[PDB]
Amino acid sequence: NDRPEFVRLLISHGLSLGHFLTPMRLAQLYSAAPSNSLIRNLLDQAPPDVGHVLRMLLGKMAPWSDLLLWALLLNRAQMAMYFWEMGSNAVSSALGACLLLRVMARLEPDAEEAARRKDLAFKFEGMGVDLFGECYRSSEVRAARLLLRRCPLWGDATCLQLAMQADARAFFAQDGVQSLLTQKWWGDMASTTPIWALVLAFFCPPLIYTRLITFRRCLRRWFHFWGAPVTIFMGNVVSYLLFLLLFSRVLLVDFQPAPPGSLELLLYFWAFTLLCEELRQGLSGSLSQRLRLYLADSWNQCDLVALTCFLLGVGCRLTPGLYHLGRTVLCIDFMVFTVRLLHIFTVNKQLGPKIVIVSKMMKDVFFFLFFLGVWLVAYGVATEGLLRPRDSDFPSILRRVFYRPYLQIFGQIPQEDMDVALMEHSNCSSEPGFWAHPPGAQAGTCVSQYANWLVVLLLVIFLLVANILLVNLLIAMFSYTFGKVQGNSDLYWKAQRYRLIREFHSRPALAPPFIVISHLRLLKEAERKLLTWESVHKENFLLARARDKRESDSERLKRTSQKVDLALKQLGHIREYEQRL
């Protein structure tokens, strides 16, 4: 019956959960799902039979844990919170609960039950963040090293992976996580090394052996410097920029119908190297499960698209009779690579969230495209019908209907092709009425001037509507999107920081063009103690929160009211006692 306080009270007074919970009991608890609830639908679609549903949701790639899962699935806030309060893996359980709740909410159709699930997920994320903050404050090494970078039973995935899947940016936004991430990002070098120092040392490899960089000793230092993920990132940035420069050089100058030249062959080798690197990333990051995980990242999808287009372009050009098609597809592929270049901006705090802002504004552009398509069809067809141009060729009709108004949106207003006062009258066609000869090349040989004032009126209305109303509707959508992801800029940047560090922490130390040799080279009681320490700190955190709650004004008022009621009762009792005697 969902009595959270009462179940807490009952368990408090000497009830052994281990001897209580039974498979039949758990089956009944799950059968207590409310009528046609989402969990009921999932159970029916899938004994409790709970493993299958969890594997379906997440991806499949101690009574307290079971009760917590049950409460989360049935969406009982208070009971879930209580069960978590006395679980085993507090932080991992909190992150897993947030993940599961967010997944179900996004999957739920209620549109308000989803709101409650999201709110519960936020509460769990906040609790996990606070608990981990306290753990980190107590002992940085213990918490950082072991709690996060540990594979639990929840999904056999590190806590950070759970946070990333749950998009629990607030979790990434705290001090301990960011300190650990920075330490990983700088590898063996001191995290306090100036950026300019690193950049300068990058082009002067001998210089690393000086006091400029802070950490036989020579080889150890050399490998520490060149293996640090930050150095790998800088090297990859340089190599990617050089690759784009080479691509542009070839495309603009060295591309000819003749067989490939030296530079073009170098570009082919470079692209093949990039393909090998992407294949390595996909194949080592359960083969089907790994492949699905790799394809789940947008940047990997962009890389695959770029490489596929490049391969098609090379194939087409090599064919005797497809040179132009190959060149065109290669131009588009270069555009794709240049857009992919944005991935490196995530390293910077100021440019990090801007990528997310652009990605979100693309959807608004899509919807505005719907609106603008409707309006352009209307106006363009109307104008084309009014003018009755004599070319009337289908490509020309599409031009004058869609393309010309679209440019009119951007200040390109061809008055000479629409106004008749600005065109010289001529006897163009035998058809009745008067005709004018526009000077434009693709404006039709001659247009009708019957009702031309109406064309100008439509032009005025279109200018107003398009250039102001619709464009500023789109801009208002952009402003709203920007503001939405501006108050949380830091959170987005921290999440991007984690993604970037994870990507570059497991990459070969050599930049792509030379990465071929690296690819060839490629070809317990402690946990008990750690969990006990975590549980102790969880108990301290809960006790502190309860102490604060007891000191709240509402609690003081309640307590004093009940206490003074007791005092009044005792006063009546003593008055009666005095009366008797």
Binding site: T532, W533, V536, L543, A546, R550
Partner: protein, 246 residues
Amino acid sequence: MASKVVAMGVAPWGVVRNRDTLINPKGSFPARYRWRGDPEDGVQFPLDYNYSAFFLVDDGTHGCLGGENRFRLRLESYISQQKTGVGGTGIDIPVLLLLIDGDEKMLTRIENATQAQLPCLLVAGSGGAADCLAETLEDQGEARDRIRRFFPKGDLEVLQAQVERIMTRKELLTVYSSEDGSEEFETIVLKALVKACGSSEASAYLDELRLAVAWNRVDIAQSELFRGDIQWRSFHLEASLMDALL
């Protein structure tokens, strides 16, 4: 493991299993204790493995209970009258006894301890021998004595006399207010310690002050330790101030 706290064991010699494994006149610096033996009996019990040190009182018996009460009480009293090192230059080490349920023998133990002038704390709802005294402090008495304790010895008015004797020295007993799972009683310990001293000499209250500093019970310390009754000197507060700053 979550870290210092030390646990001390006081059990009768005769209810510990595998005693013969612990007999060596020439020295027993090494020793192996089989604390997970399959057989189980209601007389012999296995030693815990979490305690840093054990004390086995020998009463010349092959198994019984209550053979350590007198020695334990004497040791606690001696601790209550001992300074924290540096001879007399240190300060008195506070002591108190926590009671959780019990029986008539436990009630007698509590009475002996109170007559020894050692603070005792009782927990409400623990069960017999503990909740009864808590109710008596809060406040039919005979009915409660029979109710909160099993039928045996309930008719025995010796229990009533023991309860009256406990009440005679209620200045030391203190009840534990659950307060709906309060799980917070540092203030209660300090309150018991202060109410169990009375005499104000400014040389025996330093330990309570150090405890208050170690905790965040500033209000308690101000109410009692710095209520003006005691004559606090200058050098007295130097160490406490340093601790508070750190």
